[PDB]
Amino acid sequence: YELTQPPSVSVAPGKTARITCGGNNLGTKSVHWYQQKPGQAPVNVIYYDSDRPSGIPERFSGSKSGNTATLTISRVEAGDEADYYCQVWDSSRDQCVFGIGTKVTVLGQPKANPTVTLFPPCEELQANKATLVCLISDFYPGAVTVAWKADSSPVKAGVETTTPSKQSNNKYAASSYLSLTPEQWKSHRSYSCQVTHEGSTVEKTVAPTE
Amino acid sequence: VQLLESGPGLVKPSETLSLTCTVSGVPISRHYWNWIRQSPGKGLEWIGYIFFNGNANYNPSLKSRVTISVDMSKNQFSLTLRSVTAADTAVYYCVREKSIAEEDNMVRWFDPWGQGTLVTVSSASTKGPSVFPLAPSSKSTSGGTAALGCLVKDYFPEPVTVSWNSGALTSGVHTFPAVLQSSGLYSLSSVVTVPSSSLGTQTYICNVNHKPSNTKVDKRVEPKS
């Protein structure tokens, strides 16, 4: 037995999200739905086709056709972004079956400009390493570019940048790291992290001084 | 009802993965208990169920390698998965099965779920982290807010968890995805954004746990200011 789910569903804030699950004679099987937010364990949000667990907002409702099940999220909030999984039990084989999951993305949230913080290495130098850390906080949409400079020269070697991660307040964060030797760190008068977001740039500069 | 997974985060290829779930709030004899896993970036995969009278069934793909069992005296149930390979790297969830006795078909679903345990199958050895403060510098405050953080370097396998002030500080906290380095070790950062006025009157401590290596670090982050 197999459960079909769309891979992606995009919905504007305040609108209604519909996640469909299709399977053979689904009409004769009870269907259950789980929400998995980033970095968290799943949570049951609908069981027995349409029953809502205690503590689950009434914005979540479950319905059933003969061949499909639908999880409907009304008045969607940014916090409802998650992967949603349908589940049934195949009584013939005594097997649990999950759908492949649907990623719900809430698009068109309001623009939010990043806050940039640059941390110089201090105690790390004594471990014979030097990592400059450039933290990029509280931005939307979740797309940034980072450029590093030593004095005025661009630096690409030793740079690693994470993919923007969603924060608990539904904005994005990202981090970028520049790896230097301790002697290299002391050999320049300044370093800069330049973050480009939505056509605007923020630049932070730090000088050796521990 | 609370479910608490436990067990090694690292298993060598061809060895046996063993995990245990400790159940509190209900008798282990009252419910069917299931294991689920999720390979990183992938969907949920059912492993099997157990009931204390011995009733069990399993994913047919896993049936020849897997056993689930109950320990009545400790209110625990366990997963045993033999001859593991990298295909078994996954987050493993213990769950309580709920059911409604409707005669025609089976009404069986999962609530609640444990937090999950990441098990990495690898011949590489465990490596504990080194933690460095990301201290607010003399120039790093941004208006009315200040960020500070902890850099957690060079550990294996995942995960590390970071809390702040023993969990009393949660607003503005963000722990980033770990970076897998060319060395094969992971590093990550954790930050918290706080009112700039609090740097002069509030202690900030990042609590770093790396269970695979049994390492705990409580690192004070002292503003330079």
Tab-separated table of N, CA, C and O in Angstrom, chain B residues 142-198:
chain	number	residue	atom	x	y	z
B	142	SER	N	23.896	46.637	18.755
B	142	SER	CA	23.144	47.153	17.615
B	142	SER	C	21.899	47.803	18.208
B	142	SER	O	20.893	47.136	18.476
B	143	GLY	N	22.007	49.099	18.474
B	143	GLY	CA	20.921	49.832	19.096
B	143	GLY	C	20.631	49.334	20.484
B	143	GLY	O	21.492	49.325	21.376
B	144	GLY	N	19.401	48.914	20.676
B	144	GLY	CA	18.945	48.468	21.963
B	144	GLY	C	19.128	46.996	22.215
B	144	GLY	O	18.712	46.531	23.279
B	145	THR	N	19.719	46.247	21.277
B	145	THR	CA	19.940	44.815	21.454
B	145	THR	C	21.415	44.457	21.286
B	145	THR	O	22.181	45.159	20.633
B	146	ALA	N	21.804	43.330	21.886
B	146	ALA	CA	23.167	42.833	21.785
B	146	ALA	C	23.065	41.334	21.582
B	146	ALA	O	22.228	40.691	22.213
B	147	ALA	N	23.909	40.789	20.717
B	147	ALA	CA	23.987	39.357	20.527
B	147	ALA	C	25.235	38.855	21.234
B	147	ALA	O	26.275	39.530	21.264
B	148	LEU	N	25.107	37.681	21.798
B	148	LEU	CA	26.246	36.947	22.291
B	148	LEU	C	26.035	35.479	21.986
B	148	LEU	O	24.960	35.064	21.552
B	149	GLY	N	27.084	34.688	22.165
B	149	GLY	CA	26.946	33.316	21.756
B	149	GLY	C	28.079	32.432	22.216
B	149	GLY	O	28.941	32.834	22.999
B	150	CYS	N	28.018	31.198	21.729
B	150	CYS	CA	29.027	30.182	21.981
B	150	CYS	C	29.349	29.487	20.677
B	150	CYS	O	28.448	29.196	19.887
B	151	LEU	N	30.638	29.271	20.436
B	151	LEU	CA	31.130	28.471	19.319
B	151	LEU	C	31.534	27.106	19.830
B	151	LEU	O	32.347	27.005	20.744
B	152	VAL	N	30.955	26.077	19.254
B	152	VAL	CA	31.180	24.704	19.680
B	152	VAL	C	31.926	24.008	18.557
B	152	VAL	O	31.344	23.681	17.520
B	153	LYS	N	33.216	23.754	18.770
B	153	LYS	CA	34.105	23.296	17.713
B	153	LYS	C	34.447	21.822	17.822
B	153	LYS	O	34.683	21.302	18.926
B	154	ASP	N	34.484	21.171	16.651
B	154	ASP	CA	35.243	19.936	16.415
B	154	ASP	C	34.754	18.728	17.218
B	154	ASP	O	35.513	18.124	17.992
B	155	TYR	N	33.498	18.350	17.022
B	155	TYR	CA	32.899	17.204	17.656
B	155	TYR	C	32.355	16.225	16.614
B	155	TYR	O	32.129	16.568	15.447
B	156	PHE	N	32.153	14.981	17.056
B	156	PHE	CA	31.594	13.921	16.238
B	156	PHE	C	31.028	12.864	17.164
B	156	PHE	O	31.704	12.498	18.140
B	157	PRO	N	29.851	12.297	16.874
B	157	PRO	CA	28.901	12.650	15.819
B	157	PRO	C	28.022	13.782	16.312
B	157	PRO	O	28.236	14.325	17.400
B	158	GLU	N	27.013	14.117	15.529
B	158	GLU	CA	25.956	14.991	15.999
B	158	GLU	C	25.080	14.246	17.007
B	158	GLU	O	25.048	13.020	17.020
B	159	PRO	N	24.320	14.967	17.836
B	159	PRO	CA	24.189	16.421	17.908
B	159	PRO	C	24.884	17.026	19.125
B	159	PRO	O	25.204	16.305	20.061
B	160	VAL	N	25.057	18.339	19.148
B	160	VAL	CA	25.215	19.063	20.405
B	160	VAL	C	23.950	19.865	20.632
B	160	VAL	O	23.357	20.397	19.684
B	161	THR	N	23.539	19.955	21.886
B	161	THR	CA	22.476	20.863	22.263
B	161	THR	C	23.052	21.978	23.107
B	161	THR	O	24.028	21.789	23.847
B	162	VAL	N	22.468	23.161	22.928
B	162	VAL	CA	22.862	24.350	23.661
B	162	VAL	C	21.603	24.959	24.244
B	162	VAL	O	20.598	25.124	23.537
B	163	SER	N	21.615	25.170	25.548
B	163	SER	CA	20.648	26.026	26.205
B	163	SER	C	21.383	27.208	26.802
B	163	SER	O	22.618	27.269	26.812
B	164	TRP	N	20.603	28.156	27.298
B	164	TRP	CA	21.133	29.375	27.878
B	164	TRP	C	20.528	29.563	29.260
B	164	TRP	O	19.309	29.407	29.446
B	165	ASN	N	21.395	29.856	30.223
B	165	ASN	CA	21.019	30.018	31.624
B	165	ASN	C	20.122	28.868	32.094
B	165	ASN	O	19.065	29.058	32.692
B	166	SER	N	20.577	27.647	31.822
B	166	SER	CA	19.883	26.432	32.224
B	166	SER	C	18.470	26.325	31.660
B	166	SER	O	17.628	25.596	32.207
B	167	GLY	N	18.187	26.995	30.547
B	167	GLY	CA	16.866	26.947	29.962
B	167	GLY	C	15.965	28.075	30.388
B	167	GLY	O	14.835	28.172	29.874
B	168	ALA	N	16.414	28.919	31.316
B	168	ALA	CA	15.612	30.068	31.739
B	168	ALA	C	15.592	31.159	30.687
B	168	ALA	O	14.672	31.983	30.685
B	169	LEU	N	16.539	31.155	29.762
B	169	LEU	CA	16.599	32.162	28.703
B	169	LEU	C	16.262	31.463	27.392
B	169	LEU	O	17.023	30.598	26.938
B	170	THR	N	15.114	31.819	26.782
B	170	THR	CA	14.700	31.143	25.554
B	170	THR	C	14.361	32.150	24.466
B	170	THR	O	14.562	31.893	23.274
B	171	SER	N	13.836	33.299	24.858
B	171	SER	CA	13.528	34.320	23.873
B	171	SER	C	14.821	34.781	23.215
B	171	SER	O	15.803	35.055	23.899
B	172	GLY	N	14.825	34.847	21.885
B	172	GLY	CA	15.978	35.329	21.155
B	172	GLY	C	17.096	34.311	20.989
B	172	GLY	O	18.148	34.654	20.430
B	173	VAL	N	16.896	33.086	21.448
B	173	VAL	CA	17.922	32.044	21.327
B	173	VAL	C	17.825	31.402	19.957
B	173	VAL	O	16.735	31.033	19.510
B	174	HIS	N	18.971	31.187	19.321
B	174	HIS	CA	19.013	30.411	18.089
B	174	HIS	C	20.286	29.577	18.029
B	174	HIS	O	21.402	30.113	18.104
B	175	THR	N	20.117	28.278	17.873
B	175	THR	CA	21.230	27.378	17.631
B	175	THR	C	21.236	27.031	16.147
B	175	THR	O	20.222	26.566	15.608
B	176	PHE	N	22.354	27.342	15.477
B	176	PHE	CA	22.506	27.118	14.049
B	176	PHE	C	22.761	25.666	13.663
B	176	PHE	O	23.226	24.856	14.463
B	177	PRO	N	22.474	25.333	12.408
B	177	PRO	CA	22.870	24.040	11.881
B	177	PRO	C	24.366	23.886	11.952
B	177	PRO	O	25.131	24.822	11.674
B	178	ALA	N	24.759	22.669	12.296
B	178	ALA	CA	26.167	22.320	12.335
B	178	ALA	C	26.767	22.308	10.937
B	178	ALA	O	26.110	21.962	9.943
B	179	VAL	N	28.028	22.699	10.875
B	179	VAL	CA	28.833	22.676	9.661
B	179	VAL	C	29.715	21.443	9.730
B	179	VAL	O	30.499	21.309	10.678
B	180	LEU	N	29.586	20.554	8.736
B	180	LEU	CA	30.507	19.428	8.573
B	180	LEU	C	31.784	19.899	7.873
B	180	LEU	O	31.745	20.351	6.722
B	181	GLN	N	32.912	19.783	8.550
B	181	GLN	CA	34.156	20.365	8.056
B	181	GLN	C	34.927	19.357	7.207
B	181	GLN	O	34.618	18.168	7.172
B	182	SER	N	35.967	19.849	6.530
B	182	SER	CA	36.799	18.959	5.726
B	182	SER	C	37.475	17.893	6.579
B	182	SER	O	37.815	16.819	6.070
B	183	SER	N	37.656	18.152	7.878
B	183	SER	CA	38.235	17.166	8.792
B	183	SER	C	37.292	16.010	9.122
B	183	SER	O	37.737	15.016	9.724
B	184	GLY	N	36.012	16.122	8.769
B	184	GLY	CA	35.007	15.159	9.166
B	184	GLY	C	34.370	15.447	10.505
B	184	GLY	O	33.473	14.703	10.914
B	185	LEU	N	34.802	16.499	11.197
B	185	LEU	CA	34.227	16.913	12.466
B	185	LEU	C	33.209	18.023	12.241
B	185	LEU	O	33.285	18.761	11.264
B	186	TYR	N	32.273	18.147	13.176
B	186	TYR	CA	31.254	19.179	13.112
B	186	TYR	C	31.640	20.356	13.980
B	186	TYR	O	32.408	20.218	14.930
B	187	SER	N	31.132	21.532	13.607
B	187	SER	CA	31.131	22.702	14.488
B	187	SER	C	29.806	23.441	14.322
B	187	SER	O	29.148	23.359	13.276
B	188	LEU	N	29.397	24.148	15.375
B	188	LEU	CA	28.181	24.951	15.327
B	188	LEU	C	28.302	26.155	16.255
B	188	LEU	O	29.198	26.247	17.100
B	189	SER	N	27.407	27.115	16.051
B	189	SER	CA	27.279	28.272	16.910
B	189	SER	C	25.882	28.302	17.489
B	189	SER	O	24.931	27.811	16.871
B	190	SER	N	25.773	28.923	18.659
B	190	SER	CA	24.499	29.213	19.294
B	190	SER	C	24.545	30.654	19.743
B	190	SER	O	25.555	31.120	20.291
B	191	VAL	N	23.470	31.394	19.493
B	191	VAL	CA	23.449	32.799	19.869
B	191	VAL	C	22.166	33.132	20.611
B	191	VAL	O	21.170	32.408	20.546
B	192	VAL	N	22.231	34.217	21.368
B	192	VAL	CA	21.048	34.821	21.976
B	192	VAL	C	21.156	36.334	21.834
B	192	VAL	O	22.237	36.920	22.013
B	193	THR	N	20.044	36.949	21.467
B	193	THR	CA	19.938	38.391	21.336
B	193	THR	C	19.175	38.901	22.541
B	193	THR	O	18.101	38.383	22.853
B	194	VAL	N	19.775	39.843	23.259
B	194	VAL	CA	19.233	40.336	24.520
B	194	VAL	C	19.195	41.854	24.492
B	194	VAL	O	19.946	42.496	23.744
B	195	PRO	N	18.367	42.459	25.342
B	195	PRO	CA	18.446	43.910	25.562
B	195	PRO	C	19.850	44.359	25.934
B	195	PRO	O	20.468	43.841	26.872
B	196	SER	N	20.343	45.359	25.199
B	196	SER	CA	21.703	45.845	25.428
B	196	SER	C	21.909	46.292	26.872
B	196	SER	O	23.008	46.150	27.406
B	197	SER	N	20.869	46.813	27.526
B	197	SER	CA	21.008	47.264	28.910
B	197	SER	C	21.313	46.128	29.889
B	197	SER	O	21.772	46.400	31.006
B	198	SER	N	21.064	44.869	29.513
B	198	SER	CA	21.250	43.765	30.449
B	198	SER	C	22.683	43.263	30.524
B	198	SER	O	22.996	42.493	31.439
